[PDB]
Amino acid sequence: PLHST
Amino acid sequence: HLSDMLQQLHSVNASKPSERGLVRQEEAEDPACIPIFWVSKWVDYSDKYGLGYQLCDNSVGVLFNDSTRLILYNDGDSLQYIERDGTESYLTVSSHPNSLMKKITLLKYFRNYMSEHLLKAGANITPREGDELARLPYLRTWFRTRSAIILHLSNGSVQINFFQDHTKLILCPLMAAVTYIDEKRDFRTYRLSLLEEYGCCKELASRLRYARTMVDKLLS
Q1: Among B103, B136, B169, which residue terminates a domain?
Q2: Strand, helix or coil at B195?
Q3: CA 20 to 30 Å from B30, out of B50, B110, B113, B216?
Q4: B201 CB within 8 Å of a chain A CB
Q5: What is the DSSP string of A1-5?
């Protein structure tokens, strides 16, 4: 992933 | 204090906490050790610019690819810039040197994006009432593995977010504590020395073994 949830 | 964290982790892990005949993990919780700060959101745009993040007080930061940082306080204007060698200056989004224009624009875009997207880790914990301009920790370094993102803050804390199951550790070498955020978003802070005494479940024990490997990478 390139960002958090 | 990464060396202190390594000592604390080596010690708990050598004690084999999930092989206690009776695991009493609950006795190791200490709410007074709860961390003040952790990373609530993050955006990896490191292919071009850097790593943007939000702390749990809603402040924002960016660790740019050139090892400089901008920290936007939760008042939305007050700003700290950290140069490569760590030199700190104070300014605002409203009044800044022209040389910082591009970085400030980038900060604004990261801020906007994390204002509009993503969940806040630790959202169940009461928002702190305290000095909103007291010096914020900043992201000293970060890296990713196949399994996790590792975030090292200037106050010594190390946060590890596991991608697959959304579980997280927030390790503080000053409190000598670990906060575990589990798959149901329960948020519990444990003293590492008491995990030695009382044990812990295999899930937390496994994550603490991984944590030690990550702290070793940070020290390298």
Answers
A1: B136
A2: helix
A3: B216
A4: no
A5: --B--
CATH code, domain carrying B147: 3.30.1120.30
B125 SS3 class: coil
Question: Is B119's Cβ below 8 Å from some Cβ in A?
Answer: yes
Together in a domain, B18 and B50: no
Residue B82: what are its φ and ψ, rounded to 5°?
A: -120, 115
Between chain A and chain B, the number of residue pairs with CB atoms below 8 A apart is 24
Asked whether the beta carbons of residue B118 and residue A3 sit closer than 8 angstroms, the reply is yes
Closest by Cα among B171, B214, B168 to B192 = B171
Give residues with Cβ within 8 angstroms of B74, minimum separation 6.
Answer: B57, B58, B59, B132
Q: Domain check: are B119 and B67 in the same one? A: yes
CA distance B181 to A5: 13
> What technique solved it?
X-ray
Specify the resolution in Å: 1.4
